[PDB]
Amino acid sequence: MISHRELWAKIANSINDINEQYLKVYEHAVSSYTQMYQDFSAVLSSLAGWVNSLKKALEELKEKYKDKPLYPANNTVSQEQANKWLTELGGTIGKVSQKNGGYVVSINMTPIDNMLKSLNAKYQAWNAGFSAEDETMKNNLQTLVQKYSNANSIFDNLVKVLSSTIS
Amino acid sequence: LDGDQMISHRELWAKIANSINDINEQYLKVYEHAVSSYTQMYQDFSAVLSSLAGWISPVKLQVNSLKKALEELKEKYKDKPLYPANNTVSQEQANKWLTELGGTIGKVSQKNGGYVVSINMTPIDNMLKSLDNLNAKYQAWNAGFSAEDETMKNNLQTLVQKYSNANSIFDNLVKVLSSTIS
């Protein structure tokens, strides 16, 4: 026989682990990215009443969150570890990059770098490509949010089904 | 009580096994159906969306083959509920599921004295209305016609989601029982 108490302790450890490794991770990714965009969203509001003052804030924000990783946070990680997550997030969301010897998942700056690389037929085309890279972020943010709101629901339901398993 | 009791590995599987059956029977056999139904109902509405593209010409349309086609879907899904697949259930339970589905998807309707979550047809009813209350008046009708169609495509994808999650839950349950032997 087993114990009946070692069991509850068993589920308790898993709950705490599922949260620290999975739940809390997603939250960071969302918060970080959500933060970055919540700032770029400013460069979009400022450039309204406005290629230097813009191209500046672009390289300035590109500096802020340039050292703000989605994973980890305060703590560093592995190579084959920053990849499985890179894929879990969506790949197009972050780009793994070595750090002080370790390896972390850094927010992909493909959009920003591309907008700066370009900083009627010259505007109607630029405001089309630049704004096309804006939605890419607006999207990557939503997908990440939905895929986070999923882990939450999944988690909650499994926890209930597990604690309800006894008794 | 007094205070911990003890089970045994085989007894352990029995527990996990029941949870899985209960969950499956009680949960995802419930979702798998609701999706199968709504998905079917929509595909049938998507079969008309193509036909409609043939009743538009200059721009006049055959509002007869239309509505008399919409009312043909209603009749087909008037006795097809999202839950329960068979028999009826308490009004308190039928409502509990109305929420789990999204609320805007189905409508709990009394049947035989009991209850059952019947797929909401109010959008189809919104089309039949506007379809009988008759490039400026057409832009409007179609505008509100493609709006209701967007209210169905949404209800599905969002229902298809909660289902995918129901699967994961089950999938995770299985891993536990499997990762318990060994």
Question: Smallest Cβ distance to A165: which of B4, B8, B15?
Answer: B15
CB B91: neighbour CB atoms within 10 A? 13
CATH number of the CATH domain containing B36: 1.20.1710.10
Q: Which residues contact B50 (CB under 8 A, 6 or more apart)?
A: none
Q: How far is B120 from chain A (nearest CA, A)?
A: 25
Eight-state DSSP code of residue A71: B
- Resolution of the experimental model in angstroms, please? 3.1
Cβ-Cβ contacts under 8 Å for B51 (sequence gap 6 or more): B65, B69
3-state secondary structure of B36: helix
Cα dihedral A111→A116→A118→A121 (10° resolution): 80
**With contact defined as beta carbons under 8 Å apart, do B66 and B81 qualify?**
no
A165, A166, A167: best mutation site toward chain B, by most B Cβ within 10 Å? Answer: A165
DSSP assignment of B64-123 equals HHHHHHHHHHHHHTSS-EEE-SSS-B-HHHHHHHHHHHTSSSEEEEEETTEEEEEEP-HH
Q: Give the tokens for residue B156.
A: 């599905």
> Which helix (H) or strand (E) covers residue B165, if one does?
helix B138-178
Q: Which domain holds residue A98?
A: 2-167
Looking at A2-125, list the stretches that DSSP marks H as alpha helix, in order from N- to C-terminal side: 5-17, 24-46, 53-64, 79-89, 110-116
R_g over Cα of chain B = 22
Interacting residues of A66 by C-beta distance below 8 A, sequence separation 6+:
A106, A109
Please state the domain count of chain B: 1
B170: which 2 tokens?
């089950």
